[PDB]
mmCIF file of all heavy atoms in Angstrom:
data_model
loop_
_atom_site.group_PDB
_atom_site.id
_atom_site.type_symbol
_atom_site.label_atom_id
_atom_site.label_comp_id
_atom_site.label_asym_id
_atom_site.label_seq_id
_atom_site.Cartn_x
_atom_site.Cartn_y
_atom_site.Cartn_z
ATOM 1 N N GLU R 50 -54.795 -241.172 -5.365
ATOM 2 C CA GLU R 50 -55.006 -242.619 -5.282
ATOM 3 C C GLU R 50 -55.361 -243.182 -6.640
ATOM 4 O O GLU R 50 -55.262 -244.387 -6.871
ATOM 5 C CB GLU R 50 -56.166 -242.932 -4.329
ATOM 6 C CG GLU R 50 -56.053 -242.347 -2.925
ATOM 7 C CD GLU R 50 -57.375 -242.486 -2.139
ATOM 8 O OE1 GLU R 50 -58.295 -241.648 -2.295
ATOM 9 O OE2 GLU R 50 -57.493 -243.448 -1.372
ATOM 10 N N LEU R 51 -55.867 -242.323 -7.525
ATOM 11 C CA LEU R 51 -56.200 -242.751 -8.878
ATOM 12 C C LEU R 51 -55.672 -241.756 -9.937
ATOM 13 O O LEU R 51 -56.467 -241.063 -10.594
ATOM 14 C CB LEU R 51 -57.721 -242.933 -9.008
ATOM 15 C CG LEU R 51 -58.396 -244.128 -8.323
ATOM 16 C CD1 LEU R 51 -59.935 -244.049 -8.565
ATOM 17 C CD2 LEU R 51 -57.837 -245.445 -8.794
ATOM 18 N N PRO R 52 -54.319 -241.674 -10.091
ATOM 19 C CA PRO R 52 -53.671 -240.863 -11.155
ATOM 20 C C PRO R 52 -54.280 -241.018 -12.548
ATOM 21 O O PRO R 52 -54.693 -240.023 -13.149
ATOM 22 C CB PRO R 52 -52.225 -241.360 -11.128
ATOM 23 C CG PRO R 52 -51.990 -241.625 -9.686
ATOM 24 C CD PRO R 52 -53.308 -242.246 -9.177
ATOM 25 N N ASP R 53 -54.406 -242.246 -13.039
ATOM 26 C CA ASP R 53 -54.898 -242.442 -14.409
ATOM 27 C C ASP R 53 -56.368 -241.996 -14.538
ATOM 28 O O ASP R 53 -56.790 -241.522 -15.595
ATOM 29 C CB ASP R 53 -54.737 -243.901 -14.847
ATOM 30 C CG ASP R 53 -53.294 -244.391 -14.785
ATOM 31 O OD1 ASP R 53 -52.379 -243.728 -15.340
ATOM 32 O OD2 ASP R 53 -53.087 -245.473 -14.198
ATOM 33 N N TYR R 54 -57.138 -242.094 -13.460
ATOM 34 C CA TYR R 54 -58.579 -241.796 -13.535
ATOM 35 C C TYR R 54 -58.852 -240.349 -13.857
ATOM 36 O O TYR R 54 -59.548 -240.003 -14.827
ATOM 37 C CB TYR R 54 -59.284 -242.154 -12.216
ATOM 38 C CG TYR R 54 -60.801 -242.171 -12.324
ATOM 39 C CD1 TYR R 54 -61.496 -243.369 -12.497
ATOM 40 C CD2 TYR R 54 -61.539 -240.977 -12.284
ATOM 41 C CE1 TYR R 54 -62.882 -243.377 -12.619
ATOM 42 C CE2 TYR R 54 -62.919 -240.982 -12.409
ATOM 43 C CZ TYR R 54 -63.582 -242.172 -12.568
ATOM 44 O OH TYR R 54 -64.946 -242.143 -12.694
ATOM 45 N N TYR R 55 -58.330 -239.482 -13.027
ATOM 46 C CA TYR R 55 -58.634 -238.076 -13.168
ATOM 47 C C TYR R 55 -58.101 -237.426 -14.487
ATOM 48 O O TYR R 55 -58.641 -236.424 -14.986
ATOM 49 C CB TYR R 55 -58.125 -237.364 -11.928
ATOM 50 C CG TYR R 55 -59.060 -237.492 -10.717
ATOM 51 C CD1 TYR R 55 -59.009 -238.582 -9.866
ATOM 52 C CD2 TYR R 55 -59.995 -236.482 -10.439
ATOM 53 C CE1 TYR R 55 -59.866 -238.665 -8.736
ATOM 54 C CE2 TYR R 55 -60.848 -236.560 -9.321
ATOM 55 C CZ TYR R 55 -60.778 -237.657 -8.480
ATOM 56 O OH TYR R 55 -61.594 -237.710 -7.364
ATOM 57 N N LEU R 56 -57.032 -237.999 -15.026
ATOM 58 C CA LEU R 56 -56.460 -237.559 -16.295
ATOM 59 C C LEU R 56 -57.301 -238.005 -17.501
ATOM 60 O O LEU R 56 -57.252 -237.357 -18.546
ATOM 61 C CB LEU R 56 -55.023 -238.087 -16.442
ATOM 62 C CG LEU R 56 -54.009 -237.588 -15.433
ATOM 63 C CD1 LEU R 56 -52.727 -238.450 -15.550
ATOM 64 C CD2 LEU R 56 -53.719 -236.059 -15.572
ATOM 65 N N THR R 57 -58.064 -239.092 -17.330
ATOM 66 C CA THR R 57 -58.954 -239.674 -18.346
ATOM 67 C C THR R 57 -60.410 -239.151 -18.269
ATOM 68 O O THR R 57 -61.091 -239.066 -19.289
ATOM 69 C CB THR R 57 -59.008 -241.216 -18.134
ATOM 70 O OG1 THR R 57 -57.692 -241.702 -17.880
ATOM 71 C CG2 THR R 57 -59.588 -241.941 -19.345
ATOM 72 N N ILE R 58 -60.887 -238.840 -17.058
ATOM 73 C CA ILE R 58 -62.270 -238.438 -16.829
ATOM 74 C C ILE R 58 -62.382 -236.898 -16.721
ATOM 75 O O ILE R 58 -61.825 -236.257 -15.845
ATOM 76 C CB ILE R 58 -62.860 -239.183 -15.603
ATOM 77 C CG1 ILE R 58 -62.645 -240.676 -15.775
ATOM 78 C CG2 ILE R 58 -64.389 -238.903 -15.408
ATOM 79 C CD1 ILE R 58 -63.152 -241.254 -17.092
ATOM 80 N N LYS R 59 -63.106 -236.329 -17.665
ATOM 81 C CA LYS R 59 -63.316 -234.897 -17.768
ATOM 82 C C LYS R 59 -64.114 -234.376 -16.555
ATOM 83 O O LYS R 59 -63.675 -233.452 -15.894
ATOM 84 C CB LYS R 59 -64.036 -234.588 -19.115
ATOM 85 C CG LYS R 59 -64.273 -233.075 -19.452
ATOM 86 C CD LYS R 59 -63.314 -232.497 -20.529
ATOM 87 C CE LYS R 59 -63.422 -230.953 -20.656
ATOM 88 N NZ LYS R 59 -64.831 -230.469 -20.581
ATOM 89 N N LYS R 60 -65.242 -235.016 -16.240
ATOM 90 C CA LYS R 60 -66.167 -234.548 -15.198
ATOM 91 C C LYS R 60 -66.427 -235.647 -14.148
ATOM 92 O O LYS R 60 -67.377 -236.429 -14.275
ATOM 93 C CB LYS R 60 -67.462 -234.110 -15.882
ATOM 94 C CG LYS R 60 -68.426 -233.397 -14.984
ATOM 95 C CD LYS R 60 -69.760 -233.193 -15.700
ATOM 96 C CE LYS R 60 -70.855 -232.956 -14.701
ATOM 97 N NZ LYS R 60 -70.336 -232.037 -13.665
ATOM 98 N N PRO R 61 -65.554 -235.747 -13.123
ATOM 99 C CA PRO R 61 -65.704 -236.870 -12.187
ATOM 100 C C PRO R 61 -67.018 -236.797 -11.376
ATOM 101 O O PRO R 61 -67.501 -235.694 -11.063
ATOM 102 C CB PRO R 61 -64.470 -236.734 -11.318
ATOM 103 C CG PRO R 61 -63.416 -236.096 -12.296
ATOM 104 C CD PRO R 61 -64.248 -235.070 -12.964
ATOM 105 N N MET R 62 -67.603 -237.952 -11.074
ATOM 106 C CA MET R 62 -68.922 -237.990 -10.420
ATOM 107 C C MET R 62 -69.050 -239.191 -9.489
ATOM 108 O O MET R 62 -68.578 -240.270 -9.796
ATOM 109 C CB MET R 62 -70.043 -237.962 -11.473
ATOM 110 C CG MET R 62 -71.514 -237.856 -10.887
ATOM 111 S SD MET R 62 -71.837 -236.321 -9.935
ATOM 112 C CE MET R 62 -71.609 -235.036 -11.162
ATOM 113 N N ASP R 63 -69.658 -238.980 -8.321
ATOM 114 C CA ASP R 63 -69.989 -240.084 -7.422
ATOM 115 C C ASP R 63 -71.327 -239.794 -6.736
ATOM 116 O O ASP R 63 -71.847 -238.695 -6.858
ATOM 117 C CB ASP R 63 -68.865 -240.323 -6.419
ATOM 118 C CG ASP R 63 -68.538 -239.106 -5.549
ATOM 119 O OD1 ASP R 63 -69.388 -238.229 -5.320
ATOM 120 O OD2 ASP R 63 -67.386 -239.062 -5.063
ATOM 121 N N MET R 64 -71.874 -240.762 -6.019
ATOM 122 C CA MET R 64 -73.219 -240.617 -5.426
ATOM 123 C C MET R 64 -73.271 -239.616 -4.294
ATOM 124 O O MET R 64 -74.321 -239.039 -4.047
ATOM 125 C CB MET R 64 -73.757 -241.954 -5.011
ATOM 126 C CG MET R 64 -74.003 -242.778 -6.249
ATOM 127 S SD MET R 64 -74.749 -244.378 -6.027
ATOM 128 C CE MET R 64 -76.239 -243.919 -5.125
ATOM 129 N N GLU R 65 -72.131 -239.380 -3.639
ATOM 130 C CA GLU R 65 -72.071 -238.389 -2.544
ATOM 131 C C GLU R 65 -72.189 -237.008 -3.134
ATOM 132 O O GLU R 65 -72.904 -236.173 -2.584
ATOM 133 C CB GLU R 65 -70.784 -238.468 -1.724
ATOM 134 C CG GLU R 65 -70.741 -239.700 -0.843
ATOM 135 C CD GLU R 65 -71.614 -239.595 0.393
ATOM 136 O OE1 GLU R 65 -72.221 -238.523 0.633
ATOM 137 O OE2 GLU R 65 -71.669 -240.596 1.135
ATOM 138 N N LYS R 66 -71.556 -236.779 -4.282
ATOM 139 C CA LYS R 66 -71.776 -235.518 -4.974
ATOM 140 C C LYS R 66 -73.259 -235.342 -5.346
ATOM 141 O O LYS R 66 -73.839 -234.254 -5.166
ATOM 142 C CB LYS R 66 -70.882 -235.371 -6.214
ATOM 143 C CG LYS R 66 -70.997 -234.028 -6.905
ATOM 144 C CD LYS R 66 -70.186 -232.956 -6.171
ATOM 145 C CE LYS R 66 -70.541 -231.544 -6.635
ATOM 146 N NZ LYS R 66 -69.534 -230.511 -6.232
ATOM 147 N N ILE R 67 -73.893 -236.388 -5.844
ATOM 148 C CA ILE R 67 -75.319 -236.286 -6.244
ATOM 149 C C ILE R 67 -76.202 -236.021 -5.042
ATOM 150 O O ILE R 67 -77.118 -235.175 -5.081
ATOM 151 C CB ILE R 67 -75.784 -237.569 -6.973
ATOM 152 C CG1 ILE R 67 -75.027 -237.723 -8.297
ATOM 153 C CG2 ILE R 67 -77.251 -237.504 -7.197
ATOM 154 C CD1 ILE R 67 -75.087 -239.108 -8.948
ATOM 155 N N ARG R 68 -75.911 -236.740 -3.967
ATOM 156 C CA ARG R 68 -76.667 -236.670 -2.711
ATOM 157 C C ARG R 68 -76.580 -235.296 -2.024
ATOM 158 O O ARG R 68 -77.528 -234.838 -1.392
ATOM 159 C CB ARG R 68 -76.146 -237.776 -1.756
ATOM 160 C CG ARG R 68 -76.924 -237.929 -0.480
ATOM 161 C CD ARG R 68 -76.114 -238.655 0.575
ATOM 162 N NE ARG R 68 -76.622 -238.341 1.912
ATOM 163 C CZ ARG R 68 -77.709 -238.871 2.479
ATOM 164 N NH1 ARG R 68 -78.452 -239.787 1.849
ATOM 165 N NH2 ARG R 68 -78.060 -238.477 3.702
ATOM 166 N N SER R 69 -75.423 -234.658 -2.154
ATOM 167 C CA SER R 69 -75.167 -233.343 -1.618
ATOM 168 C C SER R 69 -75.974 -232.279 -2.385
ATOM 169 O O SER R 69 -76.570 -231.388 -1.770
ATOM 170 C CB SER R 69 -73.670 -233.073 -1.682
ATOM 171 O OG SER R 69 -73.371 -231.764 -1.260
ATOM 172 N N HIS R 70 -76.047 -232.413 -3.704
ATOM 173 C CA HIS R 70 -76.798 -231.461 -4.512
ATOM 174 C C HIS R 70 -78.253 -231.582 -4.097
ATOM 175 O O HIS R 70 -78.873 -230.587 -3.720
ATOM 176 C CB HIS R 70 -76.717 -231.760 -6.014
ATOM 177 C CG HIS R 70 -75.426 -231.378 -6.660
ATOM 178 N ND1 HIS R 70 -74.834 -230.145 -6.481
ATOM 179 C CD2 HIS R 70 -74.644 -232.046 -7.541
ATOM 180 C CE1 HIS R 70 -73.725 -230.085 -7.194
ATOM 181 N NE2 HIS R 70 -73.588 -231.225 -7.849
ATOM 182 N N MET R 71 -78.778 -232.808 -4.149
ATOM 183 C CA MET R 71 -80.136 -233.112 -3.722
ATOM 184 C C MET R 71 -80.460 -232.546 -2.329
ATOM 185 O O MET R 71 -81.485 -231.905 -2.150
ATOM 186 C CB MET R 71 -80.364 -234.639 -3.740
ATOM 187 C CG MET R 71 -81.744 -235.147 -3.231
ATOM 188 S SD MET R 71 -81.925 -236.984 -3.228
ATOM 189 C CE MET R 71 -81.017 -237.546 -1.767
ATOM 190 N N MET R 72 -79.608 -232.817 -1.343
ATOM 191 C CA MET R 72 -79.840 -232.345 0.024
ATOM 192 C C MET R 72 -79.767 -230.825 0.141
ATOM 193 O O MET R 72 -80.400 -230.253 1.021
ATOM 194 C CB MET R 72 -78.853 -232.957 1.032
ATOM 195 C CG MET R 72 -79.026 -234.432 1.335
ATOM 196 S SD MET R 72 -80.719 -234.990 1.525
ATOM 197 C CE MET R 72 -80.523 -236.775 1.395
ATOM 198 N N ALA R 73 -78.995 -230.175 -0.718
ATOM 199 C CA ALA R 73 -78.996 -228.724 -0.773
ATOM 200 C C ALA R 73 -80.187 -228.191 -1.624
ATOM 201 O O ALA R 73 -80.235 -226.995 -1.948
ATOM 202 C CB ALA R 73 -77.654 -228.222 -1.320
ATOM 203 N N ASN R 74 -81.132 -229.079 -1.975
ATOM 204 C CA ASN R 74 -82.289 -228.774 -2.858
ATOM 205 C C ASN R 74 -81.911 -228.178 -4.199
ATOM 206 O O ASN R 74 -82.651 -227.362 -4.745
ATOM 207 C CB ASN R 74 -83.286 -227.839 -2.154
ATOM 208 C CG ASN R 74 -84.065 -228.529 -1.088
ATOM 209 O OD1 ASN R 74 -84.417 -229.704 -1.228
ATOM 210 N ND2 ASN R 74 -84.359 -227.810 -0.006
ATOM 211 N N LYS R 75 -80.774 -228.602 -4.745
ATOM 212 C CA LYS R 75 -80.222 -227.952 -5.929
ATOM 213 C C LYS R 75 -80.635 -228.596 -7.255
ATOM 214 O O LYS R 75 -80.348 -228.032 -8.316
ATOM 215 C CB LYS R 75 -78.698 -227.855 -5.845
ATOM 216 C CG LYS R 75 -78.164 -226.921 -4.775
ATOM 217 C CD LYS R 75 -76.684 -226.603 -5.045
ATOM 218 C CE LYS R 75 -76.177 -225.391 -4.253
ATOM 219 N NZ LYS R 75 -75.779 -225.715 -2.851
ATOM 220 N N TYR R 76 -81.294 -229.754 -7.229
ATOM 221 C CA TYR R 76 -81.854 -230.292 -8.478
ATOM 222 C C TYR R 76 -83.253 -229.728 -8.680
ATOM 223 O O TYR R 76 -84.098 -229.773 -7.764
ATOM 224 C CB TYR R 76 -81.935 -231.822 -8.472
ATOM 225 C CG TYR R 76 -80.596 -232.521 -8.576
ATOM 226 C CD1 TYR R 76 -80.124 -233.315 -7.535
ATOM 227 C CD2 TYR R 76 -79.809 -232.402 -9.717
ATOM 228 C CE1 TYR R 76 -78.921 -233.959 -7.619
ATOM 229 C CE2 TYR R 76 -78.584 -233.025 -9.794
ATOM 230 C CZ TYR R 76 -78.151 -233.814 -8.744
ATOM 231 O OH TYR R 76 -76.957 -234.475 -8.807
ATOM 232 N N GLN R 77 -83.506 -229.231 -9.885
ATOM 233 C CA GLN R 77 -84.767 -228.579 -10.195
ATOM 234 C C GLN R 77 -85.780 -229.539 -10.817
ATOM 235 O O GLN R 77 -87.002 -229.276 -10.803
ATOM 236 C CB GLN R 77 -84.500 -227.352 -11.082
ATOM 237 C CG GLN R 77 -83.746 -226.230 -10.328
ATOM 238 C CD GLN R 77 -83.953 -224.852 -10.939
ATOM 239 O OE1 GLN R 77 -84.260 -224.729 -12.121
ATOM 240 N NE2 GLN R 77 -83.782 -223.805 -10.131
ATOM 241 N N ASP R 78 -85.290 -230.675 -11.306
ATOM 242 C CA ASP R 78 -86.159 -231.657 -11.965
ATOM 243 C C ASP R 78 -85.515 -233.036 -11.923
ATOM 244 O O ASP R 78 -84.346 -233.167 -11.539
ATOM 245 C CB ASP R 78 -86.464 -231.205 -13.400
ATOM 246 C CG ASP R 78 -85.217 -230.750 -14.166
ATOM 247 O OD1 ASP R 78 -84.375 -231.594 -14.528
ATOM 248 O OD2 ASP R 78 -85.075 -229.541 -14.414
ATOM 249 N N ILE R 79 -86.263 -234.073 -12.298
ATOM 250 C CA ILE R 79 -85.728 -235.440 -12.239
ATOM 251 C C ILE R 79 -84.586 -235.635 -13.217
ATOM 252 O O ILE R 79 -83.528 -236.211 -12.871
ATOM 253 C CB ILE R 79 -86.795 -236.510 -12.525
ATOM 254 C CG1 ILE R 79 -87.948 -236.407 -11.515
ATOM 255 C CG2 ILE R 79 -86.179 -237.921 -12.511
ATOM 256 C CD1 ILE R 79 -87.520 -236.181 -10.068
ATOM 257 N N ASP R 80 -84.802 -235.131 -14.431
ATOM 258 C CA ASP R 80 -83.810 -235.230 -15.515
ATOM 259 C C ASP R 80 -82.445 -234.685 -15.146
ATOM 260 O O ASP R 80 -81.431 -235.217 -15.580
ATOM 261 C CB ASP R 80 -84.309 -234.508 -16.782
ATOM 262 C CG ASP R 80 -85.445 -235.248 -17.469
ATOM 263 O OD1 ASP R 80 -85.642 -236.447 -17.191
ATOM 264 O OD2 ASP R 80 -86.149 -234.631 -18.285
ATOM 265 N N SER R 81 -82.416 -233.602 -14.376
ATOM 266 C CA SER R 81 -81.143 -233.074 -13.876
ATOM 267 C C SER R 81 -80.370 -234.098 -13.037
ATOM 268 O O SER R 81 -79.166 -234.201 -13.191
ATOM 269 C CB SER R 81 -81.342 -231.780 -13.097
ATOM 270 O OG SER R 81 -81.826 -230.753 -13.950
ATOM 271 N N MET R 82 -81.044 -234.869 -12.173
ATOM 272 C CA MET R 82 -80.345 -235.894 -11.347
ATOM 273 C C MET R 82 -79.947 -237.123 -12.165
ATOM 274 O O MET R 82 -78.856 -237.691 -11.975
ATOM 275 C CB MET R 82 -81.228 -236.343 -10.183
ATOM 276 C CG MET R 82 -80.750 -237.620 -9.494
ATOM 277 S SD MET R 82 -81.882 -238.178 -8.196
ATOM 278 C CE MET R 82 -81.329 -237.126 -6.888
ATOM 279 N N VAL R 83 -80.833 -237.538 -13.067
ATOM 280 C CA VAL R 83 -80.513 -238.605 -14.016
ATOM 281 C C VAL R 83 -79.263 -238.331 -14.835
ATOM 282 O O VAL R 83 -78.445 -239.219 -15.018
ATOM 283 C CB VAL R 83 -81.719 -238.948 -14.946
ATOM 284 C CG1 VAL R 83 -81.357 -240.048 -15.888
ATOM 285 C CG2 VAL R 83 -82.938 -239.355 -14.067
ATOM 286 N N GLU R 84 -79.131 -237.105 -15.331
ATOM 287 C CA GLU R 84 -77.947 -236.688 -16.084
ATOM 288 C C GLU R 84 -76.670 -236.907 -15.275
ATOM 289 O O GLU R 84 -75.691 -237.430 -15.784
ATOM 290 C CB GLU R 84 -78.064 -235.209 -16.503
ATOM 291 C CG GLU R 84 -79.259 -234.902 -17.422
ATOM 292 N N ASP R 85 -76.668 -236.523 -13.998
ATOM 293 C CA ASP R 85 -75.502 -236.790 -13.157
ATOM 294 C C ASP R 85 -75.241 -238.269 -12.958
ATOM 295 O O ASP R 85 -74.092 -238.704 -12.986
ATOM 296 C CB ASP R 85 -75.601 -236.093 -11.807
ATOM 297 C CG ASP R 85 -75.438 -234.590 -11.920
ATOM 298 O OD1 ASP R 85 -74.929 -234.120 -12.941
ATOM 299 O OD2 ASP R 85 -75.821 -233.866 -10.992
ATOM 300 N N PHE R 86 -76.273 -239.055 -12.749
ATOM 301 C CA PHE R 86 -76.063 -240.497 -12.630
ATOM 302 C C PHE R 86 -75.468 -241.063 -13.925
ATOM 303 O O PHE R 86 -74.497 -241.875 -13.932
ATOM 304 C CB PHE R 86 -77.406 -241.204 -12.297
ATOM 305 C CG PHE R 86 -77.696 -241.336 -10.806
ATOM 306 C CD1 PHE R 86 -78.707 -240.631 -10.220
ATOM 307 C CD2 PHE R 86 -76.950 -242.192 -10.015
ATOM 308 C CE1 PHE R 86 -79.004 -240.784 -8.876
ATOM 309 C CE2 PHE R 86 -77.186 -242.313 -8.683
ATOM 310 C CZ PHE R 86 -78.236 -241.642 -8.107
ATOM 311 N N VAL R 87 -76.051 -240.644 -15.037
ATOM 312 C CA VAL R 87 -75.577 -241.077 -16.354
ATOM 313 C C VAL R 87 -74.123 -240.698 -16.535
ATOM 314 O O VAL R 87 -73.324 -241.487 -17.075
ATOM 315 C CB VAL R 87 -76.475 -240.463 -17.516
ATOM 316 C CG1 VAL R 87 -75.917 -240.742 -18.976
ATOM 317 C CG2 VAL R 87 -77.904 -240.970 -17.393
ATOM 318 N N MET R 88 -73.751 -239.495 -16.091
ATOM 319 C CA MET R 88 -72.332 -239.084 -16.182
ATOM 320 C C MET R 88 -71.462 -240.094 -15.428
ATOM 321 O O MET R 88 -70.416 -240.571 -15.939
ATOM 322 C CB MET R 88 -72.132 -237.658 -15.646
ATOM 323 C CG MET R 88 -70.725 -237.071 -15.739
ATOM 324 S SD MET R 88 -69.970 -237.010 -17.393
ATOM 325 C CE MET R 88 -71.028 -235.769 -18.239
ATOM 326 N N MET R 89 -71.929 -240.483 -14.248
ATOM 327 C CA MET R 89 -71.165 -241.377 -13.395
ATOM 328 C C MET R 89 -70.982 -242.732 -14.047
ATOM 329 O O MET R 89 -69.845 -243.293 -14.035
ATOM 330 C CB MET R 89 -71.862 -241.530 -12.047
ATOM 331 C CG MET R 89 -71.066 -242.277 -10.980
ATOM 332 S SD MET R 89 -72.008 -242.394 -9.440
ATOM 333 C CE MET R 89 -73.286 -243.575 -9.988
ATOM 334 N N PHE R 90 -72.077 -243.262 -14.619
ATOM 335 C CA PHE R 90 -72.021 -244.614 -15.227
ATOM 336 C C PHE R 90 -71.243 -244.567 -16.530
ATOM 337 O O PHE R 90 -70.512 -245.490 -16.843
ATOM 338 C CB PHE R 90 -73.396 -245.246 -15.452
ATOM 339 C CG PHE R 90 -74.245 -245.325 -14.218
ATOM 340 C CD1 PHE R 90 -75.561 -244.879 -14.240
ATOM 341 C CD2 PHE R 90 -73.751 -245.881 -13.062
ATOM 342 C CE1 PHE R 90 -76.343 -244.969 -13.134
ATOM 343 C CE2 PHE R 90 -74.531 -245.972 -11.941
ATOM 344 C CZ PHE R 90 -75.826 -245.520 -11.967
ATOM 345 N N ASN R 91 -71.420 -243.498 -17.294
ATOM 346 C CA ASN R 91 -70.514 -243.243 -18.416
ATOM 347 C C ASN R 91 -69.043 -243.189 -18.004
ATOM 348 O O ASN R 91 -68.206 -243.747 -18.687
ATOM 349 C CB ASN R 91 -70.904 -241.979 -19.207
ATOM 350 C CG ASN R 91 -71.921 -242.280 -20.299
ATOM 351 O OD1 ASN R 91 -71.806 -243.299 -21.005
ATOM 352 N ND2 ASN R 91 -72.913 -241.408 -20.452
ATOM 353 N N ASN R 92 -68.735 -242.528 -16.895
ATOM 354 C CA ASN R 92 -67.355 -242.401 -16.466
ATOM 355 C C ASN R 92 -66.786 -243.766 -16.118
ATOM 356 O O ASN R 92 -65.689 -244.115 -16.560
ATOM 357 C CB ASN R 92 -67.207 -241.468 -15.248
ATOM 358 C CG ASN R 92 -67.424 -240.000 -15.575
ATOM 359 O OD1 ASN R 92 -67.423 -239.585 -16.747
ATOM 360 N ND2 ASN R 92 -67.636 -239.187 -14.516
ATOM 361 N N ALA R 93 -67.539 -244.543 -15.341
ATOM 362 C CA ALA R 93 -67.119 -245.901 -14.923
ATOM 363 C C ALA R 93 -66.889 -246.873 -16.071
ATOM 364 O O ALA R 93 -66.003 -247.750 -15.999
ATOM 365 C CB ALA R 93 -68.127 -246.497 -13.965
ATOM 366 N N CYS R 94 -67.735 -246.741 -17.090
ATOM 367 C CA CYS R 94 -67.633 -247.579 -18.265
ATOM 368 C C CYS R 94 -66.491 -247.117 -19.154
ATOM 369 O O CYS R 94 -65.792 -247.956 -19.714
ATOM 370 C CB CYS R 94 -68.942 -247.609 -19.013
ATOM 371 S SG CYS R 94 -70.224 -248.669 -18.098
ATOM 372 N N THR R 95 -66.281 -245.794 -19.249
ATOM 373 C CA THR R 95 -65.118 -245.275 -19.951
ATOM 374 C C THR R 95 -63.807 -245.814 -19.382
ATOM 375 O O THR R 95 -62.999 -246.353 -20.136
ATOM 376 C CB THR R 95 -65.082 -243.720 -20.026
ATOM 377 O OG1 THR R 95 -66.272 -243.240 -20.659
ATOM 378 C CG2 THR R 95 -63.887 -243.233 -20.855
#
């Protein structure tokens, strides 16, 4: 559905991916979750 997106974005990210990590207790600290959010907002702005 988004050909140009995936070819341009190295590490795709959305909130469901973040939420799944969190729910699997996979974030060890706050900074780890912030980094993923930042990746997402960087991706959207890119």
Side-chain angles (χ1 to χ4, degrees), residues 50-83 85-95:
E50 305 169 277
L51 288 178
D53 302 309
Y54 193 99
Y55 280 85
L56 296 168
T57 317
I58 308 307
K59 184 104 190 319
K60 190 189 159 42
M62 186 62 62
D63 59 25
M64 293 184 55
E65 288 284 356
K66 185 79 194 196
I67 295 164
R68 186 199 157 78
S69 176
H70 284 312
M71 177 182 78
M72 290 319 165
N74 287 324
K75 292 196 164 83
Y76 289 116
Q77 292 203 336
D78 47 71
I79 301 317
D80 289 343
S81 295
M82 166 184 278
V83 181
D85 289 342
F86 270 111
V87 173
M88 183 57 68
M89 189 180 70
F90 305 131
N91 273 318
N92 288 345
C94 286
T95 303

